């Protein structure tokens, strides 16, 4: 199992909003900056959010992040078929002195 907990899968239709939860502890998500990235087999992995809610240059505002307490969420509005991919949250764990990641959420566009 993963140190950070994500749902294995999420699905919605084009144009709809999806959110992906990521649950942790005070040692990791509670006290530390959360990042998110996506990877679909065959294409490059790409970071979408960092420092909880900031977007790399080139990521559109359809993507956003919110962290409160020991949970972080990635929101995707205007869902596009090109958003199909595995999505992962990650953060530093102060107790383990190590980066930890969620186990991944497969996003299916219906």
Report the site for Zn ion in 65-94 (rule: CB under 5 A).
86
CA distances from 79 to 27, 34, 63, 106 (A): 32, 22, 10, 14
Site for a second copy in 71-100 (CB under 8 A): 88, 98-99
Residue 41 CB burial class (10 angstroms; 0-12, 13-18, ≥19): exposed
Nearer to Zn ion, 31 or 77 (CB): 31
Give the Cβ contact number of residue 33 at 10 Å: 16
Find the binder of Zn ion among 39, 46, 55, 62 (CB under 5 A). 39
Residue ranges binding a second copy (CB under 8 A): 2, 35, 37, 39, 44-47, 50, 54-58, 88, 98-99, 101, 103-104
């Amino acid at each position: 199992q993963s140190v950070l907990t994500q749902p294995p899968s999420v699905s919605a239709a084009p144009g709809q909003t999806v959110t992906i939860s990521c649950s942790g502890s005070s040692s990791n998500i509670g006290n530390n900056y959360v990042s998110w990235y996506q990877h679909l087999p065959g294409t490059a992995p790409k970071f979408l959010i960092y420092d909880n809610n900031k977007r790399p240059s080139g990521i559109p505002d359809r993507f956003s992040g919110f962290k409160s307490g020991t949970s972080a969420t990635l929101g995707i509005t205007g869902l596009q078929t090109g958003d199909e991919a595995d999505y992962y949250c990650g953060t530093w764990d102060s107790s383990l002195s190590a980066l930890v990641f969620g186990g991944g959420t497969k996003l299916t566009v219906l």
